[PDB]
Structures are given as structure tokens and as C-alpha cells.
Amino acid sequence: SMENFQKVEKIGEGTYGVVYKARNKLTGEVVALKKIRLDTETEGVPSTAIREISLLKELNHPNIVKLLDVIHTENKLYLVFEFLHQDLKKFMDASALTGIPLPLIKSYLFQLLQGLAFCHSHRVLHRDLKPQNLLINTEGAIKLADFGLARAFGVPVRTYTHEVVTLWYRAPEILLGCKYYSTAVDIWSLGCIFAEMVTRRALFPGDSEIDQLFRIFRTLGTPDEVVWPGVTSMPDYKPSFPKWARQDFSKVVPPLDEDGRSLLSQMLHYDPNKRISAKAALAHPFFQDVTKPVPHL
Amino acid sequence: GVNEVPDYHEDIHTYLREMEVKCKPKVGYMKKQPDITNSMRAILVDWLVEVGEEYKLQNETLHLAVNYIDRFLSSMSVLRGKLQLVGTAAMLLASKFEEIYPPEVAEFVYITDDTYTKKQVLRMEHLVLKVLAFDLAAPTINQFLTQYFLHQQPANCKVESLAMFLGELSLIDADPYLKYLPSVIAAAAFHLALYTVTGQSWPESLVQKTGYTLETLKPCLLDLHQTYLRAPQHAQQSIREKYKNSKYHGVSLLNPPETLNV
Numbered sequence: 001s002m003e004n005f006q007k008v009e010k011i012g013e014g015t016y017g018v019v020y021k022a023r024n025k026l027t028g029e030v031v032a033l034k035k036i037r038l039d040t041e042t043e044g045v046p047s048t049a050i051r052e053i054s055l056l057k058e059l060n061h062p063n064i065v066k067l068l069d070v071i072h073t074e075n076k077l078y079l080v081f082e083f084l085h086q087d088l089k090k091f092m093d094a095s096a097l098t099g100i101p102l103p104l105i106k107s108y109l110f111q112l113l114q115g116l117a118f119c120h121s122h123r124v125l126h127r128d129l130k131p132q133n134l135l136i137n138t139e140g141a142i143k144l145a146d147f148g149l150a151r152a153f154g155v156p157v158r159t160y161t162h163e164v165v166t167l168w169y170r171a172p173e174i175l176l177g178c179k180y181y182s183t184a185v186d187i188w189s190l191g192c193i194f195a196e197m198v199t200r201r202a203l204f205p206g207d208s209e210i211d212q213l214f215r216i217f218r219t220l221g222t223p224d225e226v227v228w229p230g231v232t233s234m235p236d237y238k239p240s241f242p243k244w245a246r247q248d249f250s251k252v253v254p255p256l257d258e259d260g261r262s263l264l265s266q267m268l269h270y271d272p273n274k275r276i277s278a279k280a281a282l283a284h285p286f287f288q289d290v291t292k293p294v295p296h297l
Numbered sequence: 298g299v300n301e302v303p304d305y306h307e308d309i310h311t312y313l314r315e316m317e318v319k320c321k322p323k324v325g326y327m328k329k330q331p332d333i334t335n336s337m338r339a340i341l342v343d344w345l346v347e348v349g350e351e352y353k354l355q356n357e358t359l360h361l362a363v364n365y366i367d368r369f370l371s372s373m374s375v376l377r378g379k380l381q382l383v384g385t386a387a388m389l390l391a392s393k394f395e396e397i398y399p400p401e402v403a404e405f406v407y408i409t410d411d412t413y414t415k416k417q418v419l420r421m422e423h424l425v426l427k428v429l430a431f432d433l434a435a436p437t438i439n440q441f442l443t444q445y446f447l448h449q450q451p452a453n454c455k456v457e458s459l460a461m462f463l464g465e466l467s468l469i470d471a472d473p474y475l476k477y478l479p480s481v482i483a484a485a486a487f488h489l490a491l492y493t494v495t496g497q498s499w500p501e502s503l504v505q506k507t508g509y510t511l512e513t514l515k516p517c518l519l520d521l522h523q524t525y526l527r528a529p530q531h532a533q534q535s536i537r538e539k540y541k542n543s544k545y546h547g548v549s550l551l552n553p554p555e556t557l558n559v
């Protein structure tokens with residue numbers, strides 16, 4: 001079954017299973033294998049895996065991690081993935097001194113948006129966009145990965161799991177405990193990621209949910225019924241929130257040009273209904289001159 | 298607003314149309330099954346409806362389960378004694394796919410009166426996964442219904458329940474509903490629900506969306522009218538019972554119309 005795969009090394013552990021780099025002994029292809037243990041006397045195949053596999057089988061796009069195979073045993077599942085050199089978090093950390101070139105940033109955001117638009121066009125929320133789940137290769141590509149927390153949604157959307165998205169990338173609608181969320185929550189994460197690629201520090205690094213909101217408000221201005229209609233009627237909204245003025249994006253992301261700043265603000269709009277779509281974002285003037293440079297690895 | 302994904306409704310609709318063709322069971326599968334019948338299948342689905350109420354499952358879960366079953370039985374001969382095993386495993390998988398809080402496997406075992414062991418359930422789960430090749434994200438009647446509702450002005454909860462109700466009735470009877478695509482059935486349920494409560498017909502805006510006219514919907518609407526008419530006389534009743542409750546506006550209790558304008 002796995003006779004043709006030679007393990008090379010461990011490369012970490014996602015929301016579920018454990019991930020190895022491997023080599024197809026016959027074809028020479030380098031892959032990542034996700035080993036998922038099957039609870040054969042208790043719970044069977046984890047729902048995490050049922051969603052990841054089923055959604056990735058449908059999602060075939062250059063900016064979405066390619067699932068090559070699923071190899072069954074009675075006791076294990078191995079997902080075979082194309083191998084990508086590393087994740088964006090490791091890349092950022094490696095680029096802590098040198099910085100990331102602006103054209104590469106712009107290229108990556110453009111690709112992330114192409115991948116995401118494809119997801120939304122195919123009725124899938126990702127719900128766990130963070131640098132650790134974005135994979136780069138040596139040729140300048142980037143791809144959405146780890147669809148364990150993903151969900152095929154209907155139109156219109158219904159109530160889904162609230163415990164979603166890593167805190168720092170979590171949209172204010174989820175924080176304030178809203179009944180419904182949609183494609184907008186993914187755009188928020190990418191906004192956070194955009195900013196993080198520019199500064200290589202997380203935009204909103206909270207210690208708690210209340211701390212998370214404070215971080216968002218202090219930088220974008222405390223929202224009101226003018227900016228975000230229905231915000232003050234939100235489940236976990238607190239009349240008592242301090243009222244901060246919006247911080248200029250000159251302070252927030254100094255390196256960023258006027259176009260970048262405009263795109264960023266639209267990505268971090270408080271109102272989910274005004275938050276820009278990935279589709280619209282692809283047209284933004286920021287990407288007029290977009291190229292595909294290769295990273296410095 | 299964003300909850301109706303305006304930048305995406307059109308592409309999503311087009312995608313589901315392509316996908317419901319992919320996930321379509323084989324029309325004639327029951328004739329090719331030596332030991333199981335449309336009758337037995339009706340008993341199975343009707344039982345899944347009960348299970349769905351006992352566990353307060355999404356209706357979407359029930360529809361998914363039935364898609365799983367029909368596709369499995371399109372590929373695999375199954376003996377009568379194992380029909381329920383296939384159904385339990387499909388329900389389990391639909392729940393894991395669709396539900397925030399699926400029931401535990403143990404609960405799936407309990408509901409079969411211990412006809413089957415836990416191990417049988419889990420093994421069937423895996424076999425079902427292999428046969429469908431994990432292609433579980435199947436478009437359902439409901440996914441089309443919810444989108445068609447958007448075309449109402451204003452929203453009417455009676456039309457919404459009633460269409461849901463007629464949709465579920467179709468799950469029961471492979472003959473004739475295996476010949477209709479989810480989107481066709483959904484349209485026919487929505488027209489019939491609209492006509493019964495309001496008087497209005499299938500709107501032009503949905504003709505433009507779907508490409509379906511009342512002409513092309515004619516065959517399915519006749520079968521659904523028949524089914525609606527004969528419902529209180531069906532051996533299977535769990536859906537009629539289900540849709541008596543205030544939860545669904547008691548739409549099942551509405552006397553059906555006697556004719557259409559054709």
C-alpha cells in the first residue's frame with residue numbers, strides 16, 4: 001500500500017493526524033503524507049477527515065494544496081499531498097531580519113485571493129486561514145492548505161460551529177457571538193495575513209477574546225451604528241467598550257503604499273456585508289502591476 | 298447581504314447544477330438489486346426521518362444520508378438484512394459531514410435495536426466511504442430550495458415549510474423520484490408550495506436563474522401533485538407527522554389543491 005513510499009522526515013502535525021515528507025520510490029515524486037488513525041472500535045473516521053478529503057477532492061485550483069491520493073488500510077488513512085517547501089509562518093520568521101520584498105507580498109496576496117475566490121465560488125468556507133496553513137514552494141507559488149476546519153455551506157448560510165478560526169485571525173462577527181457568518185470571515189483572516197506579511201508581526205495578537213476585540217478597536221476605531229449597523233445589538237457587544245479613534249494606516253503598516261492601504265482597509269471592514277469579496281479584491285488597483293517573483297530560500 | 302454571498306450565488310448555483318449530475322444515483326438501480334425493493338427503501342428512509350427527529354438533526358443531514366444510500370446501492374448488491382446497516386452508516390456519515398454536534402456512534406447502534414454491532418457500523422462506514430470515494434458534498438433538494446426562497450418578496454414561512462415538506466416526501470419513493478434531479482424536484486416543490494398557499498406560480502426570476510420553465514417542470518410536478526394528494530394514504534407517515542408541528546407551521550395539515558393551471 002505504502003510500499004512505494006519511503007519516509008524522509010517528520011514535518012509536523014495539523015488540526016488532526018501527523019505529517020511526513022516522503023518519496024515515491026518508483027516515480028521520484030516527493031510528497032507529504034498525512035497519517036490519520038482510524039478509531040476502528042470507537043468513533044471510526046473523524047469528521048475532520050471526511051470534510052478535508054471530500055472538499056479537497058472537489059477543489060482543484062493552482063492555489064489550493066493538491067490532494068493526490070487517499071490510501072486505505074483497515075486501521076489507517078494516508079492522504080498523499082504534493083509537497084511544498086514550507087509554510088508562510090516559517091518563511092516570515094526566516095525573513096525577520098531581511099524583510100519580504102513588496103512584489104512577493106503582493107504576488108502572494110493575489111494568489112491567496114485567487115485560491116479563496118475558488119473556495120467561495122464552490123461553496124466552501126476555509127475557517128482557519130493563518131500563515132501556518134499557507135504553503136509556499138521555491139517557484140513563487142502559495143497555496144491554501146489544512147481544510148480540516150472547512151465546511152461546505154448552503155445559500156443562504158445557516159448556523160455553523162462557533163469555535164472556529166485561530167484567535168488572532170478571528171473576525172469581529174465571530175467574537176461578538178453572531179448567529180451567522182459567511183465568506184467574510186475568511187477575508188478578515190487574509191487581511192490580517194496581508195498586514196502580517198508587510199510587518200512580519202501579527203496584526204491583532206490577543207491573549208483572550210476580550211483582549212482580541214480591544215486590539216481590533218484600538219487600531220480600526222471602535223465601531224458604532226454608523227460604521228457597522230447592528231453592531232451595538234450584537235450578542236457580546238458591551239456598551240462599556242472604550243471609544244478609540246481609527247489609527248492611520250501610515251502608522252499601522254508604514255511600508256504599504258496608498259493602494260495596499262485601501263485594499264487592507266476594505267479587507268478589515270467591520271461590517272461583514274461591506275467587507276470586500278476575494279472576487280472584487282482581485283480587481284483592486286493594488287494588483288495592476290502584480291508579478292510572480294521567486295522567494296529567497 | 299454577505300449571508301447570501303451575492304458575489305458567489307451565481308457561480309455556486311452553476312457548480313451545484315454540475316455536481317448534482319455527478320452525484321446522481323442510477324435511475325434503474327432497484328431492478329438490479331435481487332433482494333431489495335422500492336418498498337423496503339421507503340421503510341428505510343421513513344425510519345431515517347424518525348431518527349432525524351429523535352436526534353434533532355438538520356433536514357440537510359437526512360437528504361445527504363439518502364443521497365449516500367442511493368449511490369451506494371447503485372454500485373453494491375445488498376441483502377435485505379443489511380439494508381438497515383447501509384442506512385445507519387450513511388446517516389452517521391451525513392451527520393459527521395453536516396452537523397455541528399453529530400450523535401456518537403453508540404447512538405447509531407442503539408437506534409438499530411442492536412440488530413448490528415458497533416463494529417459492523419464502523420466497518421460499513423468505511424466501506425461506504427470507499428464506494429462513494431469520499432465524494433460526500435452532494436447537492437440536495439434543500440440546497441436548491443433555500444436559494445429559490447431568496448426570490449420571494451416578501452418571505453413566506455408557510456411556502457417555505459410546505460416546499461420543504463414536499464421535498465422530503467420525494468425522498469421516500471424511488472419510483473418515480475430517482476428520475477428527477479434535486480434541482481428539478483426542488484423547483485417543483487417550490488412551485489407547488491407557492492401555488493397552494495399564495496396562488497402565485499414559479500416566478501420569472503427563477504426561470505431566468507434555473508432555465509426551468511413550468512413546461513419543463515410539468516412531468517415532475519404531476520408526480521409531486523399525485524404524491525401530495527395521496528400522502529395521507531401512504532404507508533409511510535413520519536414526514537406528515539413531522540410537518541404537523543408548529544415548528545413547520547403545520548403545513549402537512551393543509552388540504553392540497555385539486556388541480557393546477559395546465
Ligand SMILES: Nc1cc(I)ccn1
Binds near residue numbers: 002020022035
Ligand atoms: N508505511 C509508511 C508510512 C509512512 I508516514 C511512509 C512510508 N511508509
Ligand SMILES: Nc1cc(I)ccn1
Binds near residue numbers: 083085086135
Ligand atoms: N509541507 C507540506 C505540507 C502539506 I499538509 C502539504 C504539502 N506540503
Ligand SMILES: Nc1cc(I)ccn1
Binds near residue numbers: 211214215218
Ligand atoms: N489591548 C488593550 C489596550 C488598551 I489602551 C486597553 C486595553 N487593552
